[PDB]
From a paper:
Deacetylase from the extremophile Pyrococcus chitonophagus has been analyzed by X-ray crystallography, small-angle X-ray scattering, differential scanning calorimetry, isothermal titration calorimetry and NMR to determine its structure, thermodynamics and enzymatic properties. It is a hexameric, zinc-containing metalloenzyme that retains its structural integrity up to temperatures slightly exceeding 100 °C. It removes the acetyl group specifically from the non-reducing end of the sugar substrate. Pch-Dac crystallizes as ‘a dimer of trimers’, with two doughnut-shaped trimers stacked back-to-back along a molecular three-fold axis, with a 8–10 Å channel through the middle of this assembly.
Three crystal forms were analyzed, including monoclinic crystals of the protein-substrate complex (Pch-Dac-lig), having two protein hexamers in the crystal’s asymmetric unit and trigonal crystals of the unliganded protein (Pch-Dac), having half a hexamer in the asymmetric unit, with the other half being related by the crystallographic two-fold axis. A (GlcNAc)2 substrate molecule was found in each substrate-binding cavity of the 12 crystallographically independent subunits in the Pch-Dac-lig structure. The electron density clearly indicated two connected sugar rings. The GlcNAc moiety that is closer to the active site is held in place by a network of hydrogen bonds to the surrounding protein residues. The N-acetyl group is directed toward Zn2+ and its carbonyl oxygen atom completes the tetrahedral coordination sphere of the Zn2+ ion (the Zn2+ to O distance is 2.1 ± 0.03 Å). The substrate’s N-acetyl group is flanked by Asp42 and His259* (* denotes that the residue comes from the neighboring subunit). Its position is equidistant from the two flanking residues (3.5 ± 0.2 Å from the carbonyl oxygen to Nε2 of His259 and to Oδ1 of Asp42). The methyl part of the N-acetyl group of the substrate is lodged in a hydrophobic pocket formed by Ile46, Phe219, Trp227 and Ile260*. The substrate approaches the Zn2+ ion in a monodentate manner, displacing the water molecule with the oxygen atom of its acetyl group. There is no evidence in the electron density of a water molecule that could act as the hydrolytic water and there is no place where a water molecule could be fitted in the immediate vicinity of the active site.
Numbering used by the authors:
A (entry chain A): 1 to 267
B (entry chain B), D (entry chain F): -1 to 267
C (entry chain C): -3 to 267
E (entry chain E), F (entry chain D): 2 to 267
Write the structure that this text describes.
């Protein structure tokens, strides 16, 4: 019912606490397996590398999905995109090990050329339906001034895949060959400007930064002079709001708030 | 009139632009509207979004036509219902919901749920209807609604605005003209499902009919589901209500046509 | 980048100020310092003059080369049932050539994608990069694709495509045939967003306003007297909005940020 | 109509299928046709392809409507003519060519020369017209013409056949119905520009008018060009002529609608 | 590695010795086949007789239906959504009459079947799961075939067969269990250039009854024209096979579907 | 001279006098040609012999490779990214053996070559720069060609040739220096309807060695079947040219690629 209620603030608090059982305090309660979905090789480590270490240690299985092949990411006129792909595959495998990640799916869409297509949704759902994960981390597609199409696409496609994985009529051949529908229990947005849940990474920062530099191709010493200070400044932004030094921010909301929720911004 | 060049305050020029130049009436914005389109992504989006307001407009004697972008093919967790069945069902569910609110005509584009293109082709389909029904008003979902993760919603919002904007251009889908349909300018644009509403409608009296017209969509709202949705729908009506100083309201964003293009102060309404 | 350790910082506000001033050398005060050549990228014929026509005059006068890229052909922009889109294109080409001269713009590239039908495709990125790589410009102006309530697809597309083209122009693996036929990669030094609701850098145009408005009306097809009764007051009201924030009468606003902030920068909004 | 199962020769069943079951009339195939569409990829394709036949049909009192798929934007080597100019020009050139042959109405889709999609959207546009003009006949270029390297031609051929086939299905572009246009079945399909024609038309009397109506397209045929095209166009008319036992003829391939689907003996006509 | 100097010699040696191409008994070691149909009814109309004979000889036959049949009615009262639901049941009944147990439905909309990468990926996924020995698909080179769903299905089928064995193609299929697969046999049905026939004179009455199972597609109005047609087709194929009623197929070695200028000579 | 009443007369006069079509020595004034190949190896397999002979007679030959060869291995250990890198080196070595110095790589992915406007624009850009006299491309009408990248390359090549001289097509090409260009000669390789041949009996062993340069595509397993095939192809072409081993091409006037119902008669 809820007919008896006359205040919005009352109905809001009752909707989150009683109806949805939304737990912002310990939101990872029953999570044994998560997917981290990264646009490019290095996006998971840069975005939430610290948190992935902490989850790996607490004994939680972490699987990467890498949307693109990193083909474009060099100014060096001597490295063909084909070489760079081969390289950045090895660089992610090394970064992965340092953080405790064992499995990585490679979609192999070309860097800069990631469709916001039905086909890519179907690919992501196939994996979600197989690995039956409890949680999914994906980049916030509403991050202001994000000018990289592969990031915007990955964010939207991830949410669509999460939302449609439980619908048996969606990519129905997945069912006809064994894969049953699946509902993810937890959705975390990384790389967000409106985080509502933080993770202290002050202890783990040095490992995070070493696991980033594992991506040698992306971070020679030239480049690293600018990126190290940046990455620290990011951790401090998140830290300020979490009252620690170095933190990683995430936006966590109930699945319901990703649809026709005009008060979604109030968490 | 007197010279606009003479103005030195923005606040002055702004108030003069809205009141004198545009004649923008936030007070009674539906003044001369005899016919409106409500554009819904899925079967149930009109009734959930602005079902109350549709009843009130139907009663005040205003013709209300639905355009449904998709067929609802995907919207069941029941492994026994093919998308083809569910479409057939949700067509009947919208026809029943429609009658309860006083809506007589519904156009079905029949784009598949989850597979609504943001294509030129879909704009052409919407314009064709607008040009035929010559409506005074169009309601459509705010495509800028924060955290809206459903592509069919984002698409419908953008496509609707594009269709409104391009319906009056004779060079757009010119075959429409060559077969009878003359260009048309809509007089009124309302965004429903918005987090930035500037105009409200008391629905406290009509809430029980609205909720009954939602449950008409049996396939979407068994009792399991309805335990969570009823409280939600009420919480939404209260959010809108708070800002309108009533209990249960429906919010809309209404702006002048001009503000949907290169208007850096559009947010200030 | 002096004596001090970046690890030793415990305040965000400190690290932020040090990132912008020392690491990035971000100059919001005089951001155009060493710019001899800019591209202005416009969705339709008239978008450059309406958006930043004043600023283009001032840059032309200070001796800076300004090149237009026009994404579309303006084919759709008339209610007159007698003008075919093919006529209107031909017309608006001449109207932009006249507007261009009044502002000191000599070169204009026409992509000739049809008005209302501008793809957000790879192909269009390749076209923009080709030009950037040829003209090796120091600066690019493009419309803010995050402008609230912008309902025109050609505007949203142009904004995104422009940023992508800027970002990918320096990657030799992107449209590699461009290289194989002479065009070397290029890094733009400056990015300005026009038509933005979050400007951080202004330009007094109070002196230039009357020329700007005359250069807009050069687009006769788009601004008969009927229409102009509503647009003149609007355009002035816009200049005042920007003016208020710049403490002058009539200004043009731009959003200028470091290249890095267009990617995974959660504090990008704080500028 | 008497006892099909007891046939044991193919040749018998074939002759009975064409004569009795389909009533296929290769002799006088235009019997009851009062209105036809000629579908041309570019401005000039109808006059070059079947200009003579169009004159003869116009004279015998039959209404002939052009559909032009593209705008001709690309068709000049002159570095001074923008595609926008050339479109405007070739529109006037087709209007003058049209009058010389007795054609009053022309639909312009305005897809750009070289950029004609083989999309669903273009089928929907063609069906809209077919459903309005309710024509008895449609002429379109044979998409199986060997070594045809122009995509706009291949596309137009396929799209035309699809539009003919789908015009009578009420579930196809259903909004067409919801706004007045009822389904329509075309009675006659003619392929022009074909290497396997089965029906000819003497144009020996009309040739000089045809050639004058081609040159109406000044932009496409200066004197330089015309030195090579006039002899070509005559050589084509002779190829068709040889098979029709006249001097100058126009060839068409006419088959029953059914043979455009899963007909392994389609080639035997 | 012979320096042979006649083409006719090298040709006969290529087919018989190098490729072991058996036009005589080409189904030798086939325990499982896919029949790929554009629309519900295309398998039964095309090769319904042959499917019965393969079912009886104990061979597993699986249907893949590309489209939903949404468009296939002139009746202004039947929504495409109804017609889909109906034609699903009609194919299930037709299927049983011929001994077909499993049917995959891609549910691409009738008239709207993309020739996209995405559709290739869908077909490969199935091929890689069912590991079939054989695939039947409609000849995309059939002259005057004006139905896009048919042309598309033909091309997509061949592409799927060709790419199913490449581990780099739709690599996620592998990462979740499905290993690459090489089909051993490719049959084109609905072809004007058949090189292998099947007597269906005994089975014809069942075939025709299994077609009429598709009530929506064949009321009595329509059936007056289709029955004679379907018989005339069987006779065309029959004439070349020296029986009354036959079904024709084009069977070639995998290799001949690529850069083979003498492919036509079989 | 309108007053002709035989077709055969007008036809012979059209080819000889009006068009000056020279099937006898069609390469007369050609100093530079493009060979357009779908995959790395398609030029050497298709017309490798002819490329050697043109290189020797002092004619510049440039390759355009549409795809990256990413898919072309059954080996589950080679990522497509590795295979691309490899086949680049394999084509560079094959190229040198035949006298080819320059190669353009479009880097569209194997199996994923769009028949898009964008790809036409890419090909025209090159044609307009290199101003070649001749272009060789695979016959898109080759019967039973089931590889989409081949069909696409054929069509795209013809479109690029046809549109390179139109200043309104990809107009930015002009605005940055590249003037329009008309190719003088079009040769279709990999065709079943050739009208012009080239003896390669002398060059065969080099051709075959230049093919095997593509190690990734031709281990010894594979080569057992391909060597006999490649010889059988050369013999097919040879038979019609009255030599042992030949390469066939279809050469027609530019005009015959449009609305020419007698195009087949050459
Ligand atoms: C798009 C833009 O202007 N921002 C730049 C980023 O694109 C860029 O990120 C890197 O871009 C490459 C090009 O596509 C990618 O291959 C690479 O994966 C990606 N790296 C990350 C961090 O995801 C960064 C750093 O090069 O600079 C921005 O300015
Ligand atoms: C996108 C997301 O994660 N949010 C969920 C919504 O997608 C979902 O909305 C319903 O989605 C179906 C799938 O396409 C539609 O058929 C149906 O019309 C739609 N309902 C509405 C209100 O339009 C809702 C309901 O399950 O839950 C969200 O969390
Ligand atoms: C309502 C909406 O979505 N936007 C309208 C605009 O379309 C329109 O702007 C003009 O649109 C034409 C059609 O695409 C363009 O050709 C024309 O250049 C464009 N003008 C500018 C400034 O770029 C305006 C003006 O009528 O109204 C908007 O509301
Ligand atoms: C495909 C090819 O290379 N053949 C040429 C034709 O494509 C070409 O056709 C002409 O193409 C122009 C640009 O697409 C069109 O504007 C023009 O209408 C069209 N001609 C006709 C009569 O349809 C012809 C003519 O230049 O030459 C062929 O060689
Ligand atoms: C293009 C044309 O004129 N040929 C017609 C066929 O397209 C048509 O095929 C039928 O099309 C329906 C709509 O796409 C399908 O639902 C239906 O399954 C299909 N029939 C078969 C046997 O597959 C046929 C039959 O109406 O008539 C041709 O003339
Ligand atoms: C389509 C089909 O069934 N025929 C096969 C050909 O497709 C195949 O060609 C090869 O395909 C690979 C995958 O795309 C390519 O990487 C490779 O370049 C290509 N070979 C050539 C000659 O270019 C051939 C050989 O693998 O076998 C046919 O059976
Ligand atoms: Zn990234
Ligand atoms: Zn919805
Ligand atoms: Zn504009
Ligand atoms: Zn043409
Ligand atoms: Zn069919
Ligand atoms: Zn190849």
């Amino acid at each position: 019912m809820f007919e008896e209620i006359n205040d919005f603030e009352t109905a809001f608090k009752r909707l989150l606490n009683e109806v949805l059982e939304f737990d912002l305090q310990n939101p990872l309660k029953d999570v044994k397996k998560v997917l981290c979905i990264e646009p490019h090789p290095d996006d998971c480590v840069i975005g939430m590398g610290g948190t992935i270490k902490r989850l790996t240690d607490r004994g939680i299985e972490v699987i990467y999905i890498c949307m693109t092949d990193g083909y474009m990411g060099t100014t060096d006129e001597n490295i063909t995109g084909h070489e760079l792909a081969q390289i950045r595959r090895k660089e992610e495998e090394e970064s992965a090990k340092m953080l405790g990640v064992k499995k990585i799916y490679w979609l192999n869409y070309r860097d800069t050329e990631l469709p916001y297509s039905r086909e890519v949704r179907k690919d992501l759902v196939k994996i979600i339906r197989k690995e039956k994960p409890d949680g999914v981390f994906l980049p916030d597609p509403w991050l202001p001034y994000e000018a990289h199409p592969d990031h915007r696409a990955t964010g939207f496609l991830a949410l669509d895949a999460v939302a449609f994985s439980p619908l048996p009529n969606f990519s129905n051949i997945d069912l006809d060959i064994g894969l049953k529908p699946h509902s993810v229990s937890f959705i975390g947005l990384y790389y967000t400007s409106r985080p509502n849940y933080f993770v202290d990474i002050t202890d783990v920062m040095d490992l995070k930064l070493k696991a980033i530099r594992a991506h040698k191709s992306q971070f020679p010493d030239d480049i690293w002079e600018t990126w190290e200070p940046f990455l620290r400044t990011v951790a401090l932004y998140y830290g300020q709001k979490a009252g620690v030094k170095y933190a990683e921010g995430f936006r966590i909301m109930p699945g319901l708030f990703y649809h026709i929720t005009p008060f979604a911004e109030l968490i």
